[PDB]
Design an enzyme around this catalytic site. Structure first.
Site, PDB file in Angstrom:
ATOM      1  N   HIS A  42       0.826  -1.220   0.000  1.00  0.00           N
ATOM      2  CA  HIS A  42       0.000   0.000   0.000  1.00  0.00           C
ATOM      3  C   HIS A  42       0.864   1.276   0.000  1.00  0.00           C
ATOM      4  O   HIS A  42       0.308   2.378  -0.172  1.00  0.00           O
ATOM      5  CB  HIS A  42      -1.052   0.010   1.134  1.00  0.00           C
ATOM      6  CG  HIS A  42      -0.514   0.300   2.506  1.00  0.00           C
ATOM      7  ND1 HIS A  42      -0.313  -0.706   3.417  1.00  0.00           N
ATOM      8  CD2 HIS A  42      -0.223   1.485   3.093  1.00  0.00           C
ATOM      9  CE1 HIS A  42       0.154  -0.120   4.513  1.00  0.00           C
ATOM     10  NE2 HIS A  42       0.222   1.198   4.363  1.00  0.00           N
ATOM     11  N   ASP A  87      -0.213  -7.790   1.424  1.00  0.00           N
ATOM     12  CA  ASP A  87       0.298  -6.443   1.566  1.00  0.00           C
ATOM     13  C   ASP A  87       1.796  -6.424   1.738  1.00  0.00           C
ATOM     14  O   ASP A  87       2.287  -6.065   2.789  1.00  0.00           O
ATOM     15  CB  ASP A  87      -0.443  -5.686   2.684  1.00  0.00           C
ATOM     16  CG  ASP A  87      -0.259  -4.180   2.642  1.00  0.00           C
ATOM     17  OD1 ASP A  87       0.313  -3.671   1.646  1.00  0.00           O
ATOM     18  OD2 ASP A  87      -0.720  -3.504   3.584  1.00  0.00           O
ATOM     19  N   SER A 179       3.556   2.262   8.556  1.00  0.00           N
ATOM     20  CA  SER A 179       3.358   1.341   7.419  1.00  0.00           C
ATOM     21  C   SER A 179       4.651   0.778   6.818  1.00  0.00           C
ATOM     22  O   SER A 179       5.595   1.521   6.589  1.00  0.00           O
ATOM     23  CB  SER A 179       2.618   2.044   6.293  1.00  0.00           C
ATOM     24  OG  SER A 179       1.257   2.215   6.639  1.00  0.00           O
TER      25      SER A 179
HETATM   26  N1  LIG Z   1      -3.749   0.773  13.957  1.00  0.00           N
HETATM   27  C1  LIG Z   1      -2.728   0.294  13.208  1.00  0.00           C
HETATM   28  N2  LIG Z   1      -1.985  -0.645  13.709  1.00  0.00           N
HETATM   29  C2  LIG Z   1      -2.412   0.855  11.892  1.00  0.00           C
HETATM   30  C3  LIG Z   1      -1.093   0.699  11.449  1.00  0.00           C
HETATM   31  C4  LIG Z   1      -0.673   1.227  10.244  1.00  0.00           C
HETATM   32  C5  LIG Z   1      -1.557   1.931   9.440  1.00  0.00           C
HETATM   33  N3  LIG Z   1      -1.096   2.473   8.257  1.00  0.00           N
HETATM   34  C6  LIG Z   1      -1.912   3.301   7.384  1.00  0.00           C
HETATM   35  C7  LIG Z   1      -2.538   2.500   6.292  1.00  0.00           C
HETATM   36  N4  LIG Z   1      -2.461   1.177   6.208  1.00  0.00           N
HETATM   37  C8  LIG Z   1      -3.087   0.855   5.029  1.00  0.00           C
HETATM   38  C9  LIG Z   1      -3.542   2.007   4.433  1.00  0.00           C
HETATM   39  C10 LIG Z   1      -4.229   2.181   3.139  1.00  0.00           C
HETATM   40  C11 LIG Z   1      -4.575   1.073   2.366  1.00  0.00           C
HETATM   41  C12 LIG Z   1      -5.182   1.240   1.127  1.00  0.00           C
HETATM   42  C13 LIG Z   1      -5.468   2.510   0.655  1.00  0.00           C
HETATM   43  C14 LIG Z   1      -5.091   3.618   1.391  1.00  0.00           C
HETATM   44  C15 LIG Z   1      -4.493   3.458   2.636  1.00  0.00           C
HETATM   45  N5  LIG Z   1      -3.152   3.050   5.223  1.00  0.00           N
HETATM   46  C16 LIG Z   1      -2.894   2.070   9.839  1.00  0.00           C
HETATM   47  C17 LIG Z   1      -3.308   1.567  11.066  1.00  0.00           C
HETATM   48  O1  LIG Z   1      -4.584   1.698  11.556  1.00  0.00           O
HETATM   49  C18 LIG Z   1      -5.635   2.230  10.742  1.00  0.00           C
HETATM   50  C19 LIG Z   1      -5.569   3.728  10.655  1.00  0.00           C
HETATM   51  C20 LIG Z   1      -5.968   4.403   9.505  1.00  0.00           C
HETATM   52  C21 LIG Z   1      -5.926   5.788   9.468  1.00  0.00           C
HETATM   53  C22 LIG Z   1      -5.455   6.459  10.576  1.00  0.00           C
HETATM   54  N6  LIG Z   1      -5.016   5.836  11.683  1.00  0.00           N
HETATM   55  C23 LIG Z   1      -5.103   4.495  11.709  1.00  0.00           C
END
Ligand SMILES: N=C(N)c1ccc(NCc2ncc(-c3ccccc3)[nH]2)cc1OCc1cccnc1
Ligand SMILES: *[C@@H]1O[C@H](CO)[C@@H](O[C@@H]2O[C@H](CO)[C@@H](O)[C@H](O)[C@H]2NC(C)=O)[C@H](O)[C@H]1NC(C)=O
Ligand SMILES: *[C@@H]1O[C@H](CO)[C@@H](O)[C@H](O)[C@H]1NC(C)=O
Ligand code: NA
Length: 227
Positions: A42, A87, A179
């Site tokens: 991603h 992923d 990420s």
């Molecule tokens: N809670 C966690 N452990 C966590 C760890 C990493 C991430 N990374 C961001 C992320 N992963 C995948 C995408 C993505 C995939 C497809 C299309 C566009 C974006 N974006 C997010 C996480 O939790 C959700 C989250 C979302 C938003 C704001 N905060 C937490």
């Protein structure tokens, strides 16, 4: 990383940073071979520079730092954006690393970590959620692998075998900006920071990680085919 701690300097030599112009942290990545990284598929944007052997989030000079360019970025063929499955992505560096105490590859084991296994997750992502607050230096946090049943219960019909849940304690999780960063269990690389819930670190919402033990054949074959 929510409620982690400053990593000890020189202790995560496989940690990489994918930067956008001029030095904007985009995603974490992990050195798995002298010329290859793994990151989350991603983390799609074209990388400007790969930064290795560097502790701080800022561009401050560190003697152990090594800069590279990505020349190949191969997402797993089973990944289909924006879905979470498969992923992972391999990034080929423009040259092999200079082996030092600060820059060292880590291996992915085909042994899948079992439920209850203690793993370390690291990154320069936000230390708070929902508030966005970036750290000054690399953060480390221990998280425990949940059973696939507890993972399915947390995210019904959202989980498959290409993922594992980890981090059972409320107030502790990986988060945005982490990420593609590493999840290391008993000295080997077993996960990548993939996704989870918002805000991060919610009770009964563990982080979701790319289950790397399922991809050693793809990782080995892709590196070999692109040598
Ligand atoms: N809670 C966690 N452990 C966590 C760890 C990493 C991430 N990374 C961001 C992320 N992963 C995948 C995408 C993505 C995939 C497809 C299309 C566009 C974006 N974006 C997010 C996480 O939790 C959700 C989250 C979302 C938003 C704001 N905060 C937490
Ligand atoms: C994550 O867990 C590891 C393993 O329990 C912690 O490392 C131990 O730290 C103390 C010394 O401070 C000793 O028991 C051992 O020398 C360490 N063991 C290993 C395997 O290194 C580590 O401190 C924890 N990290 C965080 C950020 O909580
Ligand atoms: C942060 O984590 C430690 C254990 O690593 C724990 O003792 C502490 O209570 C946590 N802090 C918060 C605010 O949850
Ligand atoms: Na902290």
């Amino acid at each position: 990383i929510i409620n982690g701690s400053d990593c000890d300097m020189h202790t995560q030599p496989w940690q990489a940073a994918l930067l956008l112009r001029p030095n904007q942290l985009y995603c974490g990545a992990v050195l798995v071979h002298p010329q290859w990284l793994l990151t989350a598929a991603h983390c799609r944007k074209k990388v400007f520079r790969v930064r290795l052997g560097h502790y701080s989030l800022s561009p401050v000079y560190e003697s152990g730092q090594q800069m590279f360019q990505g020349v190949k970025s191969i997402p797993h063929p089973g990944y289909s954006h924006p879905g979470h499955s498969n992923d992972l992505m391999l990034i080929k560096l423009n040259r092999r690393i200079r082996p030092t105490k600060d820059v060292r590859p880590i291996n992915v084991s085909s042994h899948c970590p079992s439920a209850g296994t203690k793993c370390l997750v690291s990154g320069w992502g936000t230390t708070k959620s929902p508030q966005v607050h970036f750290p000054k230096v690399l953060q480390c946090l221990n998280i425990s692998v949940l059973s696939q049943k507890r993972c399915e219960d947390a995210y019904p019909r959202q989980i498959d075998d290409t993922m594992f849940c980890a981090g059972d304690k409320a107030g502790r999780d990986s988060c945005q900006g982490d990420s593609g960063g590493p999840v290391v269990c008993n000295g080997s690389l077993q996960g990548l920071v993939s996704w989870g819930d918002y805000p991060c670190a919610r009770p009964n919402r563990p982080g979701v990680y790319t289950n790397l033990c399922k991809f050693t054949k793809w990782i080995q074959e892709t590196i070999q085919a692109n040598s």
